[PDB]
Structure formats: structure tokens, C-alpha cells
Amino acid sequence: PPIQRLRGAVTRCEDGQLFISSYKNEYQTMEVQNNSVVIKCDGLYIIYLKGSFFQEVKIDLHFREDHNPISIPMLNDGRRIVFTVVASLAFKDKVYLTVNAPDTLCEHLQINDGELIVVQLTPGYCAP
Amino acid sequence: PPIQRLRGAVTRCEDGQLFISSYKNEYQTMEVQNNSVVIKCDGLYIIYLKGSFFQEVKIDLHFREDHNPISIPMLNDGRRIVFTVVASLAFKDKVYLTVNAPDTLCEHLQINDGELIVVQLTPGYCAP
Amino acid sequence: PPIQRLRGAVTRCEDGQLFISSYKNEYQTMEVQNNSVVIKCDGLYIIYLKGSFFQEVKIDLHFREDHNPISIPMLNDGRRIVFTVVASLAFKDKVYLTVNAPDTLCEHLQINDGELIVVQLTPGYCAP
Numbered sequence A, B, C: 001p002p003i004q005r006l007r008g009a010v011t012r013c014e015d016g017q018l019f020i021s022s023y024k025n026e027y028q029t030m031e032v033q034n035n036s037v038v039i040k041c042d043g044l045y046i047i048y049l050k051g052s053f054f055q056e057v058k059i060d061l062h063f064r065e066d067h068n069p070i071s072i073p074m075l076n077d078g079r080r081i082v083f084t085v086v087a088s089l090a091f092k093d094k095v096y097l098t099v100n101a102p103d104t105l106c107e108h109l110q111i112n113d114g115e116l117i118v119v120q121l122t123p124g125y126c127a128p
């Protein structure tokens, strides 16, 4: 298989989860299912989140069920996120984003130019 | 073509633009033209900027004409930048850095150990 | 040789140095020797450090003897580090971490879920 990557639009929040869309001008080699990026091949990956968020937000990055989610810091202006993680992912991992906030804040949250990039740095076993 | 990369020295500011030099101990596979890194091959790239800047600075990273430049945050000391972006670049994109400041501040700006690294993570079409 | 990578546990501090262990669920292609990651192949590498540190800490990242170490910033909570560097490494470079603090603070320092990831992005000469 090819180097695994996905660049998704992070479009909105509903019921405490950020929606992720594959609608970007990018050649995608991973699937999005139920607003999660589906890992098929093992490897070290970069996970990168960018966006202009119009509420001060507490977003959690979930990447593997056996580790705690990473709380994503905002930049000092309290309006932008530009955050990079490197992580060891495996087949069946789901990369997704949740919001720890009252649901009213979630449903109203505006995200400008939000994107999530997941990109494989090292090769590994791929599921059939 | 080889994996596309450039590690450039970010040397000074003139007329609101940071100068970028290919004078580093690095095997360069991209060109610098008029203080911009010239993209020849499509791909996801990391763009990384580091430096010790002796004025508190508002630097904008320009990477593609159809998206807004990214305002680069300083570290909390107000003296250093160590910043990582992942972006989707294409043939004809120019990666460059501008300074939003009075020109006197620009002309006097000292940058210690400034460097810009642009490195391809995924393969793509390369221009002839 | 394969793409060079190591994901190590950053376990504790002793005598001003953070200990690095290869005991992680990762296929390692670099060695740890005396709590340093031993570089065998030239390349641009990402160096990534994450951890929850229960003292506000001043950690220095050493990666090559001809450049100054990078002082690692904490996130704004004063409790976590999630930090990414891109650097040009060569055969004989040693990547290691030191703590600038009274030794009592070092010996007592608790690090939860500490890890250092060093991963090659571009190929280069490898030592025999």
C-alpha cells in the first residue's frame, strides 16, 4: 500500500464530537468513518490539527484506546490551534476529536479553515 | 526525483520580507528564488521555523496563494520561535516569510540561528 | 538500512539527565546508549518530546555538539510538554535530554507517559 495519509476538513461540532470530512484537495489513502480516521497500517504518524475556533475550546485528540486522549492547547491568542503530535498507530485505531463543553457551545461552535492531517512516517503491517 | 527538502538560513529582514539562504550544511533538493522556496513537486510537507528573534515579531508564513498566511506564534519568552506546520503544497507554490512591522524594526531585526526547513512527507506529481 | 526511528520512554531524572529507555511497543531501528539516542544515518529528523512533568521544568534537548541545545518550552498549564523539532542529524550525533535544576528536584521528578520520538524524514549516508 501507499504511504498512509488523510487531510480532512474539521467542519463543526455536534454532540461533543468534531466532524471530519475528506472533502479537501488531497489524495487520500485512508478512510473517514463516523467522523474518525480509520488506521489500516501500523506506523509512526504525525497528527496535525489547525483551525480558528471562535470559542476558547478544550478539544481532546483520541488516537488509541490504550492511551489517554491528548488535550489540545490553543495558541496564546485563545482563538487558534496549530498543534503537532507524533504517535504510534496500529490497525483498528480511530483518530477522532471531542469537545469538553456544554452542548450549546458545541452546536454553535464556528471553526474556520479547520483541518486534521494524519500522515504515516514509517512503514508497518497493513490489514488486508 | 528525490524526496523534496530544503533547510535554509533565515538571515535578516529587508522591506518586510525575511531573507532565506540555502547556505546550510544540508543536501538541498529544492531551489530558493528571491527569498522564496520554490515548490516543484506536490505533497504534504512539513514547514518548520526556528530562530531567536531580538524583537517581539509578527511573522507571516506564506505557502500557497489560495490560503491565508499563517501568523507564526512566538514561544512564551517572546524571544524564540520553534514552530511546525503541515501543509499541502503544489508546483508553483512559493514558501516565504514576511514581517508585519514598521520598516525600521525590520531593517534592524537580529535573527540568531534562524532556519526554515521544508520537507516532503508524501510523493506527488513533479513538474519537468 | 531501514528508515531510522526510535520511540523511547523518558522515565526519570538522575544527576541532571533524563533517562531514555527503548521499552516501548515500537519497532526500533536506532540504539539507546547511556540514555542517548545514537545516530547512525544522516538525515533530517523529527525529534518529538511528550510528557506530564510534575515540576515546572527547564529541559534542554541536545542533538548535535556544534549547535546549542534547545530549551524545551512547557505548555501553558506548566505541567505538560508536547514539543516538535526538525533537525539535521549525522553519524555520531547523540540525542539526549538534560535538566537545569537543583539535583533534589531532579531525583524527585515524576514523569508520566514521557516519550521521545526520533524519526528520519530524509535518507542519508549510514555508517557501517
Ligand SMILES: *[C@@H]1O[C@H](CO)[C@@H](O)[C@H](O)[C@H]1NC(C)=O
Binding pocket: A034
Ligand atoms: C457514530 O459514532 C457514535 C460514537 O459516539 C455512535 O453514537 C454512533 O452509533 C456511531 N455510528 C456508527 C456505528 O456508525
Ligand SMILES: *[C@@H]1O[C@H](CO)[C@@H](O)[C@H](O)[C@H]1NC(C)=O
Binding pocket: B034
Ligand atoms: C523579488 O520579490 C519582490 C516581491 O515583493 C519583488 O519586488 C521583486 O521584483 C522580486 N524580484 C524578482 C522578480 O526576482
Ligand SMILES: *[C@@H]1O[C@H](CO)[C@@H](O)[C@H](O)[C@H]1NC(C)=O
Binding pocket: C034
Ligand atoms: C554515561 O554518561 C555520562 C555523561 O555525563 C558519563 O558520566 C558516564 O561516564 C557515561 N558512561 C559511559 C561512558 O557509558
